[PDB]
Amino acid sequence: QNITEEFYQSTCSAVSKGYLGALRTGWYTSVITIELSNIKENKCNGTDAKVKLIKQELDKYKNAVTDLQLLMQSTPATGSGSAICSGVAVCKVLHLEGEVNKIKSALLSTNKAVVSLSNGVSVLTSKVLDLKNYIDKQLLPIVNKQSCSIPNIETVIEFQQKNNRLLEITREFSVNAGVTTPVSTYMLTNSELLSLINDMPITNDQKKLMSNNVQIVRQQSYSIMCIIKEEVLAYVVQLPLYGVIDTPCWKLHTSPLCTTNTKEGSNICLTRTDRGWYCDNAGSVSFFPQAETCKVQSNRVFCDTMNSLTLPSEVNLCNVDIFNPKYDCKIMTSKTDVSSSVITSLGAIVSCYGKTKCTASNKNRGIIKTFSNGCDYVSNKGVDTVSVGNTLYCVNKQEGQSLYVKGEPIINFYDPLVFPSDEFDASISQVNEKINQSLAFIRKS
Amino acid sequence: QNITEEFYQSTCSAVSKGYLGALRTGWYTSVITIELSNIKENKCNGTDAKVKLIKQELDKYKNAVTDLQLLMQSTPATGSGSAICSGVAVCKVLHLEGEVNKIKSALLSTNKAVVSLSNGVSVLTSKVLDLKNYIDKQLLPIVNKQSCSIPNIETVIEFQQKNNRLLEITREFSVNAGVTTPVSTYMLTNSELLSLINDMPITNDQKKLMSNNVQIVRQQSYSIMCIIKEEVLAYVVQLPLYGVIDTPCWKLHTSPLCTTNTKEGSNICLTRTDRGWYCDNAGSVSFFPQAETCKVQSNRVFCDTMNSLTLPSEVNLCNVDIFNPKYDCKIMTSKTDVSSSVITSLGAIVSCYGKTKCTASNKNRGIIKTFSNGCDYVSNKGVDTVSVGNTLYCVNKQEGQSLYVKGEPIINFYDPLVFPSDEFDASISQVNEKINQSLAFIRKS
Amino acid sequence: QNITEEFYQSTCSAVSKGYLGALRTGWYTSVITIELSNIKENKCNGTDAKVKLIKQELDKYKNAVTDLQLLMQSTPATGSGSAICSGVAVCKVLHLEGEVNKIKSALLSTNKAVVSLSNGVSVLTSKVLDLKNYIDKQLLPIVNKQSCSIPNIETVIEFQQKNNRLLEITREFSVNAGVTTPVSTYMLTNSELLSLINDMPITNDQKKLMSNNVQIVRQQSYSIMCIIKEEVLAYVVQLPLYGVIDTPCWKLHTSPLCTTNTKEGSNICLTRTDRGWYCDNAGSVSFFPQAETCKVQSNRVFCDTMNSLTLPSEVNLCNVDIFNPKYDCKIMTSKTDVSSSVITSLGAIVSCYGKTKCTASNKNRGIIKTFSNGCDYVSNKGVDTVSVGNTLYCVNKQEGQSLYVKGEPIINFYDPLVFPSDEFDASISQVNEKINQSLAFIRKS
């Protein structure tokens, strides 16, 4: 809906609210088959140029098959094993006798079909390429006589086009040990992906979500290689199921908060930690510390709970009262006052320290705001760029309302002499405990 | 010019000087257009193989267009938004009525043309592919009658070649949400890029710089997707403008500096921080902490100020006097004495501790130097490899002069009992303050 | 052989044993040549469509050559220079007069041949593509008369197929500054790679190792561009030599170990550091801290000593007695008790703290184990998934024996009041020294 922001002058942090999250909680697996032709090499008296072209492209087909075979003889472990049991379980059933034969029978007359496998799983199977019909109908009469028949030039071109997708799939499955992500258009065309979404047990509102964000769905999908057996190449595509929909989400931005004394060696700094994406999830908050685990489109966020930490909902109270006893808000300390800026969703935090020249400009008016020393913020309303030293950042021109929440910077409530200035993973109450221990050591002395 | 190095035995660090830097300070945007053909699907009585091949490749063209359309209906946010306002501003003008019509008129007779847009911007527009002329002249008489005309086999091949670039551009813009970097040869051929450089408002010496380093220019460029409207596919290429040229640059190398006592638990360590690239920039120093933000060719360095910190020029004094009061030189402390090596531009720093077997060899002479415990350095003059434990590093055979600056290791000026051994972001004066506080706690006790 | 595991309840860590390692200790270089045709552009009266197609593909060949030339005029430095001297040394010899002429003579009649170069190096050279013979025999009579001869349509297609590999090689060498890794099938086909392995000075058991793990070999190989000179395009492929074979290897898994008091602010935490792969190597242990430097297939591990640290073999004693004086086992401390899990090779460590809902389920039985607060472990025998908060991890279904080594968690031997709770790189004896210093400051007070 309406994206809003709140800059907290006291902690040098901003919160971008109003995003609707879609969290991955399940997987929907589907079998993608390619019917191949078991045609060991055949040699006939051949010289005409069309026959040579056919045997060359046919040799590229034979090698793609032996290569997928050496990929499946020994399958190297991947860093994705913790996210693919759903699909590996389908591949293990397919290796059973008769299971590849069932899908070969269901897709005998149609391209798409639901097939009830062993393990009681009603999976949706599909056949995106048919090389067995093409090689056996158009090519075998051409290489399985005493002397080769002459194929027309249209067949030579059509076979290079059809065989291409097999080769590109073989290239991707080979360089990535059978597990590819994102799922490319070679693994699944956009036309095949949307029809696959349409044939899923999800709400009509959920099909609209995935169909309008196909690139994000591709980036949160996996393609797993199964088996080459009985003239069938099968591989599993693991598509995301978003069990959490339209959940409130926000993004925390933090920047160093130092004191602005003029004598070096007398300044202390604090920075809030755990910046990133937060989403309400099942009575708790799902936090995403890595930056690439959440894709954003407009007001919408797509996260994977695979790379999240589960925190109590009281973690949001670091945003309204950082000194609040229900949650131990985390900070880091240092004496490292280098100027920097963070481009938020609707503005910019600027931490200006020392002699750094910090400013905010409009493209036609020029410099419209000069930051003094400390931590400050400017909205995107009327601002295009922000300069810190020799670096120019661009402000997001997204529509929304910014709110500047005035307050005394909390770094000023701390005595420099007893401050712990090198904590790398501390907490507000931890630092206070270090101050009580440094104050007991001076009373005693 | 002449690359030189200075190893500082006192701080276990080396500085590689003599590089000439080219820092990105601006962007030069250009519009790249592809004229497409609005030919909704047309069906005629067709069976001949050439007609089938044409309709298949034509179907691949129709899907590439609907896919670029679903990419532009909802454009996902990227981590590059802080670096692309220059190009997003051109796309927003193109969405105005009449603006795509202007560039369609300027490139009616020629491929390249400067076009004055709204917003007073004289951008250089180009038309690298013409599918509207080819489909409407060679293909439409073939599918827009009662029965399809038979196209010759040369047309079938020429259309698969021309249509290919559209498909590869669609693949890259789709998997990357409309923003690609580096800019591939599909987005812009080397022939098109060099002619685009030649037609820029830069010095003759600056065109020679970018033309001789096209791969680095590609790696520091962005390709942004604009709009598909009125049979025109437009996308913006953002090329770097190096406002800083031939500026002095240097690279700092640091390695842990420990004491070499024989009893474990009695050794302390120090390591200089902020290793990376430094360049003189507008009265200050631009520091690049990330390693991949600066590309090196010979004596030349290409950095992006987007990922830099602006530091006072006194930061260079950590290299000549680390105990110097004008700048608080930063260090890290530990008791972690593991042997390691750093390959510098003209030699190697070796931090040898414990029982580790450290050496420097020549390919035909063998081991020519055995390092004892502590931090040392060897030039590339006569040295090919350096071995630390079970690891063999290769020495850069670049020509230059190395200078070994002798001095007492500063770790020896510190008493172990009161040393702070676990600081992760400290400073020379900070550590001295921790020593004064630990010395007041023992006087008191 | 048999993969086994040991979970140590006292330190919240697990060790996966039984892997056989293959460590890279050497390089085997090979020259890959492509004979090109020096045919500056030639123009004849041309209009027929086959001639146009030939000149278009020929123009793509001419540009691929000028592009490889601008790549070799100025070669940008790469982060791989410390691992490629073996191949750069072959390129420097090839630039000598007569050296490219020798390999051009040895591969005049055959595709593969061993060639003794200057520098006494008996390298294996190969010629994977012949464009000089094809252009000069099939194309030059077509563009080097007064008017162009008409080539048959088979030649037009065969030239687009042959020229393709040159263009794909030019694309990869251009975007990566002459050094590519992994080595793609365009640089070296699987058929060419296996024949290259077969012709190497290695044991019959070592050829079987590399031939059965070609994708891992590709990922641990480099392709380096040499020179374009006298109608010859040469580039060096650096293949790994595994000097260490069948060496014992193990993987250490660590998870935070906190106390489980009910009052926040009274809990302390410890986590073992240096998680990753360890292999016995030449009387010491080769440790691999980065996760991507070791590829695993079944019981087998493939590491590169380029990114390893050499540690004494006593480092294994942190696994049986962490309080052991022969090695100072490393830990990190905090007060950061967030629940998490680590999927091991044969089970899962679960660090459950606070109100987090931690469990282990079987697909058909449901929740079979509920973890209480502290650090615990569950084997893969009967367990499919493990849930921590809102995150579901998948358990590896690999066969092996797990051993739960019971013991009191060592975090309970520490008094909270004097514990150092913010160390980021500490050691067991270091922390004890901080406790002795905090105990002297309270006796004194």
Ligand SMILES: *[C@@H]1O[C@H](CO)[C@@H](O)[C@H](O)[C@H]1NC(C)=O
């Ligand atoms: C520090 O001492 C004050 C004084 O009584 C007390 O109120 C506060 O709770 C103490 N802080 C901690 C973190 O124990």
Ligand SMILES: *[C@@H]1O[C@H](CO)[C@@H](O)[C@H](O)[C@H]1NC(C)=O
């Ligand atoms: C530590 O004490 C000495 C003794 O007077 C003083 O000279 C020095 O400046 C002090 N160091 C710091 C960092 O305050």
Ligand SMILES: *[C@@H]1O[C@H](CO)[C@@H](O)[C@H](O)[C@H]1NC(C)=O
């Ligand atoms: C701390 O003091 C005890 C008491 O004598 C001693 O045994 C121990 O070795 C000391 N620890 C360190 C790390 O010096």
